[PDB]
UniProtKB/Swiss-Prot annotation, chain A:
Function: Subunit of the fusion protein that is processed upon entry into the host cell. Mediates fusion of the virion and cellular membranes by functioning as a class I viral fusion protein. Contains a viral fusion peptide that is unmasked after S2 cleavage. This cleavage can occur at the cell membrane by host TMPRSS2 or during endocytosis by host CSTL. In either case, this triggers an extensive and irreversible conformational change that leads to fusion of the viral envelope with the cellular cytoplasmic membrane, releasing viral genomic RNA into the host cell cytoplasm.
Impact noted for substituting L1F: In strain: Omicron/BA.1
Protein name: Spike protein S2'
Origin organism lineage: Viruses, Riboviria, Orthornavirae, Pisuviricota, Pisoniviricetes
Gene (name only): S
Residues of the full protein shown: 981 to 1029 of 1273
Length: 49, 49
């Protein structure tokens, strides 16, 4: 923001928006894959208990 | 919905700042076109008149 005029400063930060969100989308996707895995273990633990 | 027909006269070497979002003396102090501007910008030499 502090080096580029607003006419095209949105373009570069847009790449961060597409970028930083993309990592967030991957992290949550990793989480659900791990979230389901734990519940399978948890349900196994539930039966064990 | 509606039409805005803006009329003004400037130097011929001044049209660059008319582009949306651009900056300088024009877009800083006298004429700021919106970022989401919708339309066409028309100019022609008028030294004779």
């Amino acid at each position: 923001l502090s080096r580029l005029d607003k006419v095209e400063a949105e373009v570069q930060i847009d790449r961060l928006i597409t970028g930083r969100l993309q990592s967030l989308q991957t992290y949550v996707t990793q989480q659900l894959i791990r979230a389901a895995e734990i519940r399978a273990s948890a349900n196994l633990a539930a039966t064990k208990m | 919905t509606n039409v805005y027909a803006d009329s003004f006269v400037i130097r011929g070497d001044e049209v660059r700042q008319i582009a949306p979002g651009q900056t300088g003396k024009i877009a800083d102090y006298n004429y700021k076109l919106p970022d989401d501007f919708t339309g066409c910008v028309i100019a022609w030499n008028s030294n004779n008149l």
